[PDB]
Design a protein around this ligand. Sequence first.
Ligand SMILES: CCCC/C=C\CCCCCCCC(=O)O
Length: 339
Amino acid sequence: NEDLRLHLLLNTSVTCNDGSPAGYYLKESRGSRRWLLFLEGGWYCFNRENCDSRYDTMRRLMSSRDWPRTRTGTGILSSQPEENPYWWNANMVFIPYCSSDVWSGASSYAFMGALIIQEVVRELLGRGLSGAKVLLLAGSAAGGTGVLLNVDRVAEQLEKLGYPAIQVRGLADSGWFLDNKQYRHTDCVDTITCAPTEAIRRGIRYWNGVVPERCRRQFQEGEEWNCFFGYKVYPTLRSPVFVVQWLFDEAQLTVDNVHLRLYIQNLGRELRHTLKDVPASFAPACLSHEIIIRSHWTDVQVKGTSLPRALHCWDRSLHCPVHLVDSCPWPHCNPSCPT
Ligand SMILES: CCCC/C=C\CCCCCCCC(=O)O
C-alpha cells in the first residue's frame, strides 16, 4: 500500500560486498515530479579483519540475501502528511547500504557504493525519473557523507544522458565530521575506536575509493582522503546541499574515544565554526545521531523553526530562515531534543 518495494539492479556486475546483487526500494508517486533518494548509513570497514567481523555480526550491511521485499517509509520518506508535511507526495527511494565504503567504492569483498548510486539512477529514469524536476539525494550518517561524495557525480550523469530538466540537490544528515585529534589516543584496530583521519586513509586505498573530481584535482596525488570531511569537500560542490548535523554527534564522539568536558566544548565550538559559511544548515544542540528518517524528526526545533520547515524554506529559496545553528555549547540545552 504505502510500502516501498524492493528491486534489484538489472546490471548484476554492480554488487554488495559479498557479490549479492545491490538494489533500491521504491514507492512511486502518481503526479509528483519530485524524487527523494535516501542513502542508508551504518559505519564501514577498512581492512579484512574488520570486514570479516562485520560480515559475521552485521551481515545485512554487506549482502542483500536477507533484505525484506518491502519496507515502510519513515520521516522524510514517509507518505503521511502528518509525518512529512512538505514532501509526503514525492517519489520515494531508499538505497540500502551494503558496500561498507561510505558510498565511495568504484572498483568492480567488493566495494561498489558509487556505482550502485550510479546504477540506481539509470534504472529510475525508466521509472518516471526521466520526467522529473527535482532530485534530492539525501542520506544519514555514512549515507550523509555519501551525499557529499556523490551529489555532483549524480548531477553530471544526468546531463550526459540528456536530462538537464532535473535539478539535483543534496541533504547530508549526521554526515559532517571533523578530522580532529582524539580525546584519548589509541591504535587503529576496531572500526568504532580508530581515529577519523587514519580510518579513511586506510579505507580509501582498501575500497579503491573515488572522490569528486573538483575536490580531487585540488589535492596532491595519494591525498584523496581529505575529501571525506565536509569542510574540505563542500566549498567545491556545484550542487546545492543542506546540512543537518547535531552539534554533539554520538558517532563523532565514539571515534574520538568517549564512553558514557573541555574537549566537548572545542568540538561543539568548531562545529559552529565549520558551519558559519554554509548557508543551508540545521544544527540542534543535542546528544544524538541521525534524524531525517526517524518519525520524530518533526519534533526538533532551532530558533522556533522545525527541521521540515527549514528544508522547505531552503527549497523555497531555490525555485523563512534556512541557516539555523542552535546556540549554546551544551547537549540538552534545547527542550525539543529526542528521547
Ligand atoms: C566519524 C568518522 C569520521 C568520518 C569520516 C568519513 C565518513 C564516515 C561517516 C560514518 C558515520 C558512522 C556512523 C554511521 O554511519 O551510522
